[PDB]
Structure formats: C-alpha cells, structure tokens
Amino acid sequence: PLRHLRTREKRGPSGCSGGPNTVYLQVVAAGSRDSGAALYVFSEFNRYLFNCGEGVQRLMQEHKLKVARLDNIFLTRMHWSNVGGLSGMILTLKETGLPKCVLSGPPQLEKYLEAIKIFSGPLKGIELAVRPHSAPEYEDETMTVYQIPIHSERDSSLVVAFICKLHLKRGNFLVLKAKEMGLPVGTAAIAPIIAAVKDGKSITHEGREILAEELCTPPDPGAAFVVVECPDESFIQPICENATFQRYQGKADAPVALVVHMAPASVLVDSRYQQWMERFGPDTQHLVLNENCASVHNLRSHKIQTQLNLIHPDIFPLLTSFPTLSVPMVQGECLLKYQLRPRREWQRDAIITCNPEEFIVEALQLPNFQQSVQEYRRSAQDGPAPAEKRSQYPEIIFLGTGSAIPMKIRNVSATLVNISPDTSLLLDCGEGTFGQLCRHYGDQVDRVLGTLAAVFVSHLHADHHTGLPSILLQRERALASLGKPLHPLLVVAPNQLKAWLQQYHNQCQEVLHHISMIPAKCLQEGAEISSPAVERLISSLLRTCDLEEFQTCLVRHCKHAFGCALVHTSGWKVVYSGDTMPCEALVRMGKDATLLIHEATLEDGLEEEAVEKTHSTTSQAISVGMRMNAEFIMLNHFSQRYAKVPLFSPNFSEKVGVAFDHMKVCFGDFPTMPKLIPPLKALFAGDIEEMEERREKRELRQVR
Amino acid sequence: AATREFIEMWRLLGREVPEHITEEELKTLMECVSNTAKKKYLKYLYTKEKVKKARQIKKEMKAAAREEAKNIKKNFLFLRLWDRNMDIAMGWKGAQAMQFGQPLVFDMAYENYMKRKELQNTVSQLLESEGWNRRNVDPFHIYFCNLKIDGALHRELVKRYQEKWDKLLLTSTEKSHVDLFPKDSIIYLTADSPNVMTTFRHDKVYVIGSFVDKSMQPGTSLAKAKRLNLATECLPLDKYLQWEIGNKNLTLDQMIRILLCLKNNGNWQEALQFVPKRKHTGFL
RNA sequence: UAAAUAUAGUUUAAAAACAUCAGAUUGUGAAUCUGACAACAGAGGCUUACGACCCCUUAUUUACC
Numbered sequence A: 001p002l003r004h005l006r007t008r009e010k011r012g013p014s015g016c017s018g019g020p021n022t023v024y025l026q027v028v029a030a031g032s033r034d035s036g037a038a039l040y041v042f043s044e045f046n047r048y049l050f051n052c053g054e055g056v057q058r059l060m061q062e063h064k065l066k067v068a069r070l071d072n073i074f075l076t077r078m079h080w081s082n083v084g085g086l087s088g089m090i091l092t093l094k095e096t097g098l099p100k101c102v103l104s105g106p107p108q109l110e111k112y113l114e115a116i117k118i119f120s121g122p123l124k125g126i127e128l129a130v131r132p133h134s135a136p137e138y139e140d141e142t143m144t145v146y147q148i149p150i151h152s153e154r155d156s157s158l159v160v161a162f163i164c165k166l167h168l169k170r171g172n173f174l175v176l177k178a179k180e181m182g183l184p185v186g187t188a189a190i191a192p193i194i195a196a197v198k199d200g201k202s203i204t205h206e207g208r209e210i211l212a213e214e215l216c217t218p219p220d221p222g223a224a225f226v227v228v229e230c231p232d233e234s235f236i237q238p239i240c241e242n243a244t245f246q247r248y249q250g251k252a253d254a255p256v257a258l259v260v261h262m263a264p265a266s267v268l269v270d271s272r273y274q275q276w277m278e279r280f281g282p283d284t285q286h287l288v289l290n291e292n293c294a295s296v297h298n299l300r301s302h303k304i305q306t307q308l309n310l311i312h313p314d315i316f317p318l319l320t321s322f323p324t325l326s327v328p329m330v331q332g333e334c335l336l337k338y339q340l341r342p343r344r345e346w347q348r349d350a351i352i353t354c355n356p357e358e359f360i361v362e363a364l365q366l367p368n369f370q371q372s373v374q375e376y377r378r379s380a381q382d383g384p385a386p387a388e389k390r391s392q393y394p395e396i397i398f399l400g401t402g403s404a405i406p407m408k409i410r411n412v413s414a415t416l417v418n419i420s421p422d423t424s425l426l427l428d429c430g431e432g433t434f435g436q437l438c439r440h441y442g443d444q445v446d447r448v449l450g451t452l453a454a455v456f457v458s459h460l461h462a463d464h465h466t467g468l469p470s471i472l473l474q475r476e477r478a479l480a481s482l483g484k485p486l487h488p489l490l491v492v493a494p495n496q497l498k499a500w501l502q503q504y505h506n507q508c509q510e511v512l513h514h515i516s517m518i519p520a521k522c523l524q525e526g527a528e529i530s531s532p533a534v535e536r537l538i539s540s541l542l543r544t545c546d547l548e549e550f551q552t553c554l555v556r557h558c559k560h561a562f563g564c565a566l567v568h569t570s571g572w573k574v575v576y577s578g579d580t581m582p583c584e585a586l587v588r589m590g591k592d593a594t595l596l597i598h599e600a601t602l603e604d605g606l607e608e609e610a611v612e613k614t615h616s617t618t619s620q621a622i623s624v625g626m627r628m629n630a631e632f633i634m635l636n637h638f639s640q641r642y643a644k645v646p647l648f649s650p651n652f653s654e655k656v657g658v659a660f661d662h663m664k665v666c667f668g669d670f671p672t673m674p675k676l677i678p679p680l681k682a683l684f685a686g687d688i689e690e691m692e693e694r695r696e697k698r699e700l701r702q703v704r
Numbered sequence B: 001a002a003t004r005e006f007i008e009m010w011r012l013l014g015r016e017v018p019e020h021i022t023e024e025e026l027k028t029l030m031e032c033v034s035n036t037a038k039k040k041y042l043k044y045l046y047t048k049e050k051v052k053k054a055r056q057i058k059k060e061m062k063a064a065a066r067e068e069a070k071n072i073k074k075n076f077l078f079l080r081l082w083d084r085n086m087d088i089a090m091g092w093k094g095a096q097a098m099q100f101g102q103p104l105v106f107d108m109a110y111e112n113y114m115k116r117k118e119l120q121n122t123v124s125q126l127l128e129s130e131g132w133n134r135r136n137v138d139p140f141h142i143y144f145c146n147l148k149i150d151g152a153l154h155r156e157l158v159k160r161y162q163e164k165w166d167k168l169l170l171t172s173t174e175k176s177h178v179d180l181f182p183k184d185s186i187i188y189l190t191a192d193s194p195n196v197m198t199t200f201r202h203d204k205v206y207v208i209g210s211f212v213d214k215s216m217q218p219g220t221s222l223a224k225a226k227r228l229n230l231a232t233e234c235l236p237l238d239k240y241l242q243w244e245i246g247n248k249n250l251t252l253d254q255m256i257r258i259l260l261c262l263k264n265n266g267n268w269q270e271a272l273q274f275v276p277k278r279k280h281t282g283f284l
Numbered sequence C: 001u002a003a004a005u006a007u008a009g010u011u012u013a014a015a016a017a018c019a020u021c022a023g024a025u026u027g028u029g030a031a032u033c034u035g036a037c038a039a040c041a042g043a044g045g046c047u048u049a050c051g052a053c054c055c056c057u058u059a060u061u062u063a064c065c
C-alpha cells in the first residue's frame, strides 16, 4: 500500500494536530505557449494541482514534484489547454496505486472521463470522483475550496474560479508560562487540558478560569488565495461584477494573500480588469501566468541537446525559446514559490537557471568525449565529400522517442516529416507533441504548423494520439496569424478514433471542425473503394503532401493497429512502423525503402517480454529492416529504461542508427550516422556502463 | 553558560533529556549546530542511562539471587585457569603472525570524513575485528596504517584499550600502506570496485578502509585507491547471494571474518555466512 | 523516473537475548566478578511530546506496456 493513506487514517478526524505547519504555492508551468499554464499547491497533509495542461505531468516528474500524494486536481475551464494531458495524469496516479483522486471544475468533467475510456480503456484501480462547482464546499485537513462558476456574455462559455481559504492553525503552547501560573505539567496532569488550551477553549483549574488564547501565541487566521483564469475579453465583465468575489476584496477581515491570473496580456491591460485587480487591496500579491513569461521548463532537454550539439550542430540543433500597469504584479516563473504559512513571502530560491556554458564544460571534462568529437570532426568535416549531393529534403525531426509516458529526456513518440519547404506531415502525435514543435522552432512554430498537411496515428494507444487536439487548436491560431483560410486537417487514423473525438466534441469542446479524418482501413493495398467523400479526401492527401502513394497495413500489435509507407514523386520511400512486433506485411509494403523508422522498445534478451508487451527488440527491429532491404534504419519508441541511449548491440551496422529528441536527419546524413556512435558512447559512458549491469543482474536473477 | 539552562528547560518540556549529564557531554551538545542534532544527541544519552539503570536493576538482582542460593546450599588434572591459558596461547600465535602471517591492512585515512558518532563506531568494530583475528586458527598480521598519533582515532583506541594498546600484537604506524608493501601486491577492497574477487590469493595484501559511513559516501575508498595506482576488488555478493535488503558495504568485523574463512580454505558457502541474514533471502 | 524498504556485531519483537573490549593465578557455577561500549541509513524540520508526522541525500529491491 501507500504510506500517506496510513498516516491520514492514523490522525483519525484530523485529531492530535491543527493545520499544516507550512503551506506554499509553487508554479509548475509559467504559462508559456509550449508548456501551458498550471499551478501546484503544497501542504503538510494534502497536495493540489490546478489546470493540468498538456505536458504538466512531465514537468512535475522532472522537478521532483511527487505525484503519488496528489488529492484533488482543479480545472478552471474545460479546454484542452486545461484538461488536455489529464488522461496521462490519471494513468500516472493509477501506476502509483492511488486509491481515489477527486476532480473539480465544470460539470463537463464527468462526460470527459467517459470520453477518455474509448482509448484509455477502463480506469479500474483508481476512484475518479468529479466534484462540479454545483457541489457543496470542499473541506480538507488543510484548506477549504470555493468553486465560483463564471459565464461569459456542453458549454464553452463557462469558466470556474477557485477561492481557497487556509484553515486557522492553532498557536504554540508555552509550557514555561503555564507551570509558573500553577498549572502542573507532566504525565496525565497535562494530557487532558493541553488540548483545551490549544483549541482556544476556556479551561477551569482549581477554581481558576484561564483563557486559552492568553497562554498561546496568536493563531494564524488563515491566508486565502484565489486562482482565476480570464481566457479572453468576453470574461472580464462577469468576473468584475461577480457577487462572491466582492466578499473577499473590499472587506478588511477577509484579506486575500495572493491572486493567480491566468489571463493573456490584452486582458490585463483592460481598464475594467485593472480596477478589479486593485480592488483586492494593496496587501494582496498578484501572480500572472501567460505567454509573456520567458523561462525554461524542460531544463534536462536543453542540457542534453546542448551536449549533443557539440557532436553535430545540424543533426542536433539547439533548442530555441519561443508595458506599465497601475497594479504591480509578478511574472510567473517555473518553480517560483509563494509561501502562505507561517510567512507570506516570495521564495525564489528554487527557480532553475538555464546557462548553457555549464553544459558544454560538463561534456568536455568527460574522459573520452572531447577526443572522440575532435577525431570525428576531422574525419568528417575534412573528409571526402559524397559523390551524390542529395537534396536538403525530406528532413525527419524526431520530436519524441518515448514508449508509454513522457520523461525528462524522451517524450512520447512523435515524428515530423518535412516533405518540402512548404509542406509537412506528422507521423505520430503523442502528449506534448506541440510543446516539442514549439521548442524545436520557437518563433517558427507558426510557419511549421502552416505547412502541416496531414497527421498519421499508428493506433489508439495514449502515447500516439493524445496530443492531436493540441495541434488543432494551435494550428487554428497559427493559420489565423498568417491569414490563410481555415480548412480541416487531414488525419489518417483507425476508425475508432472518431468515437473519442466525437465524445469530446459533443460533451467537452468543438474540435471536429478542424478534422477531415481518413480511416486507415481504406488506405491499405487492395482495399475496398470507400464512399466518394472519403475518396476525394484520399486524393487530397496525395496532392497536398506531394506523395505518389500513401500505403498502410495491419501490424502485429493491438487491434486496429496500422503502419505507414510514404512514396514521393521523386522516388524516395519513407516507411514508418508504429508499435509492432516483427511483421511480414510491413516488409512487403516497405520493400526497397529509403528510410525505415522501426520500434526498438526493448533490448536483446527481452524477447519473452516483447511478445506479452507486443513489441520488438533492438535486434528484431534491425533484422526487419534487412529483410525489407531498407537503405537506412532509424530506431525510436524506446522504452523508458533507456532514457538516454539504448543498448548498442553488435549487429549495429552502417545502415542503422538510434534516434534522439529534437534530432534532424536527412537522406544526405546517412554516411555520417555510423560515425556518430563513438562520440555518443563517450557522452553517455556513465549511462552505458549502468544499463548492462541490469542485464547482468537480469540473467542471474532469472537463472536463480 | 547559556547552554546549561537550555537543557534544564528542555527537561521541563520532557525532551527525552537524561537526568544526570557530565560537562564533557555538554560541550558535545554545544557543537550541535541544529536543534534536531541536539534532539538526536540527547536521545542517545537518554537511552544510555535507560540501559544502564535497567542493567543495574537486573544486576543487583543477580547478586541477590546468587547469595540466597548459597545460603540454602576429588581428582583433577588441570586447575581452572583456562581464561589465562587461552590468552597466552593466542598471544603466542599472534607473535608468530607478525613474523610470518599474511599482512592485513586497516587504512585510517578516513578520519576527515567521519563524525564523532561514526568515529566511535569505527573503533568498536576495530576492537571486534582484531578480537576475531586473535581467536582465529591462522590470524592475520593486522596493520594499522595512516594512524596519526594525535588523531581522534588513535586517542579513542587508547581509551578503549587503556594499557592493552601498547601490548596488542599488531603493527600500528603513521606511514601509508604503499610505503610498506609493493604496489603490485596491494588490493584495495571496496564494494564499488568494478572487479569482482573470485579467489582469495595468499600472496596479496588486502587493504580495508577503517571507515564507517552512516552518512553514505560512495566512492570514498575508490578515489583513494585511484589516486595511487592500486588494484581494487569487491566481494561476489550478487554472484552467490540473493541480495534483497540493505547496503552492500559490510562491517569491518564481518569483512575480516569473511577473509579469515577464505584464508582457511573455506569456500564461498562458508565464507559468506557472516553476511547478515536480513540482507539476503538465501544462498545460491 | 516511480513505489515500497534501510537495525553498522547478529537476531527477536515492538526492549531483550546471544556476542565484543579491559582487568582476574579462577579449587573446577569463571555457568562468575569490577569496568568499557549501548545511536534501528543520513541530514534538516515540525510538536508539550511521539520510534509519530513532513521534505531532502545516499543505498537496496521491483516496475517502467
């Protein structure tokens, strides 16, 4: 079982103690475009999360924000920027064994939970209780939460604001004073009446009436903080005139310690909003989370990319990060803390710093890194140039090489293929895929999103299609900025994907108007001719993507799992396989392919674990490429065991290579790929010497 | 001093503070920079008295029982002078050990990485480690290297041995082990050594770091064994034992006992018996 | 990365038992006597206290679809 539940049950009805000793407010997501806006509350007995957006779980897992202790997750709006990425959050709790997690927010949450059951399956093992704003006030061992529903002038006009209030904490009991007064201390002579003096109750002792508050330090009245989101201009007026808010701002006996503002820049500059912010009083600190906050969230991703950038700048591009107001405010920053008890202050000690210079130095001081990099650089840069000068396109950007859940280094599977400078397609869209796109391009993300022609989904696993909605809303915003007309996107995915989107469309938020979905069944070789509406969509896919052929097959994976194979008018063929075991159907379709992207989830010796998990090992994946006769093989979808680098089997030839996050590969780089291994081993020498010990331990343990 | 009343009030609070405390213990509490350190140190003193008083109550009971029983209540070959005889017999073996026994080295260069709590424990295991060597059939030639005369370890050893310190049959010196034996015949045992020891070689000198790291400090001995070009080795715990719980750094008394069994032709089955049973779920 | 665990002589259970060191010329219970050492991973917190409760580091064992 879990430790925290036992401690709670030990306290009984919150007895033997008052409120939590320390309660601070930490920012997990500053509100940037890539990371979204999120807020984390810490307390001795409870922990709360607000606006669980896309990729929030990855940030908490990266910054030592424990997940197995969360109690409630509060959502200010039912919008993918706020509810998106929540599905993966629930699974993480289930893996940790959390018995129950309470969700609060708009009354559309209950429908969303059943929407995610289409692909996520049954959420057995973890109790999901939705607490809509219509539900009574929630009381905890730490604080009370007031859910305020705001309606702009399913339901897309609803925004939920939370007015939290810490419970009063009993003051310290001065033992020395009580004894001098004549109150015996020790054994049973203190146990009964110590609580009375601690609970603020008058106590009679030997005919003497003593007030509890006199002999104890002034109890904390309980600081209150507010989390409010203003998506756009249409929400300012309802917020300003809300009756409940007035009860906490103009009054003097109900001060507000902090007010989180998850609103854009344009909303804040509004005159009406400015007056409302000032109405809280000068003693109320204001925190703002929006796109104006320039900060680094995935520090590890930046660190590893900079170290890898030394080997090859082009193959390992560096990541690029994407007004006076009357009321002062503090711009949100990652890991920024605001203590609420026992002291009200800004704790900026935990803020991370992103200085590349340390990362380059750390890589160079390694034993054999610099020598290997220097050796490779002279052999390649000053070496003979290839006779055939291949074009700069297509270029494959490996935005993610994760298996099940995002981590510090590897994100869930997602690959971007740039067919030409003005067209591209996404081979997979996992959770946080847009964040990788935004980080990889920064200001150029909108341009890249404008060239997105089609999106392919291998199957319904959460690690392959949970990020599609984020692309749609962001693509809509990107298209508007360029002024191009808004047209539905072409999505190739199994038929059952419609149910999850249809359920979300009819209950949570309209998203299908951005989708022109092509079922993956009619794209297979020798497939039945579908309705003319689908057929014209098929013709659009080939024309828009400038592809001679777009093939599909059924791979050895869960039911309704499909592969891919791209054929270009030039002649080059790119074959992508999702989660699959070694399959013969894939080999036939992708024969004589130029580039092969094959799963390499598990290592050698895990063959039995592969069949139960329905995946392929490193050697199995490579053998498939040779059987398919591919000019080059790329391995991705690695298991989270090999966070940095997978085990290098002896079968690794010049026609194979591993994939990394934010890694750019072109057909002209194939001769360079084999020469990048020795530098990689030196860089990942520590991780390399730790992975095979588990293998050595594995063999002995199974032998036992 | 302000610290004296600092304790007395804590007594009124019932902070598990002992009744009688010497001034020597007070300055040790003074060094504690944190309240929790004072809280932890005081608890150690409290349990120290609790065991002693419980010891004493159970001790006077032994005297009372024995005298009562006495009130109610041949040919021999040897006099009952055995305890003296064994001490002399071990001494003769010990003297032979320092002329022909295999050198076993205890490195005392870790005094800078030890607190007072762990420095005291190191001496306790050193006393037991040397005790098992004396009783062994073929004792090692124990070497105490890098043992500064004025260091805390040397001073603590003197108090625990009193006059016996100068009569112990072991070599204690301030020179490093590299200065006493060839560098090619020295193996610095350590759990972090990448090399696993399979056979106990009788022509090699094994170095055991007299270091008790309650606060874990991995690689401390490995760095010492790497600053000087000395080979390192680790016990084959994972090879033979199904490790499940605890840390792989065994105590000094267990370490010498393991080596002693190996040096007496014992195999890994017998040698690894001394590893705590709570650490491993069986042998294979 | 996450979840359970960590007894510095060893076990037991939630304080003991068996061991360790110094002294002993022991009349065969020395099967004892007089002393030494008694820290349940480490550090920092909370509380009148608690081995409770709460963060952080290392270590061990599992899982990572």
Ligand SMILES: *O[C@H]1[C@@H](O)[C@H](n2cnc3c(=O)[nH]c(N)nc32)O[C@@H]1COP(=O)(O)OP(=O)(O)OP(=O)(O)O
Pocket (backbone or CB within 6 Å): A300, A407, A408, A640, A641, A642, A643, A644, C001, C064
């Ligand atoms: O934090 C871990 C973890 O993210 C990953 N990692 C390493 N081994 C494993 C594993 O067996 N299973 C899983 N799910 N994840 C694993 O790599 C990181 C290793 O942490 P390190 O501190 O050793 O790596 P580094 O030297 O680069 O320092 P740091 O910045 O990551 O802390």
Ligand SMILES: C[S@@+](CC[C@H](N)C(=O)[O-])C[C@H]1O[C@@H](n2cnc3c(N)ncnc32)[C@H](O)[C@@H]1O
Pocket (backbone or CB within 6 Å): B188, B189, B190, B191, B192, B207, B208, B209, B210, B211, B212, B213, B216, B217, B218, B219, B220, B221, B222, B233, B234, B235, B237, B248, B249, B250, B251, B252, B255
């Ligand atoms: C308990 S270890 C503690 C020190 C530990 N080596 C460190 O660096 O933190 C004390 C000594 O015992 C020896 N030792 C402990 N465990 C060992 C093991 N598993 N194999 C070989 N030697 C070991 C080491 O040589 C070490 O010097």
Ligand SMILES: [Zn+2]
Pocket (backbone or CB within 6 Å): A403, A404, A413, A461, A463, A464, A579, A637
């Ligand atoms: Zn997958």
Ligand SMILES: [Zn+2]
Pocket (backbone or CB within 6 Å): A459, A461, A557, A579
């Ligand atoms: Zn899959």
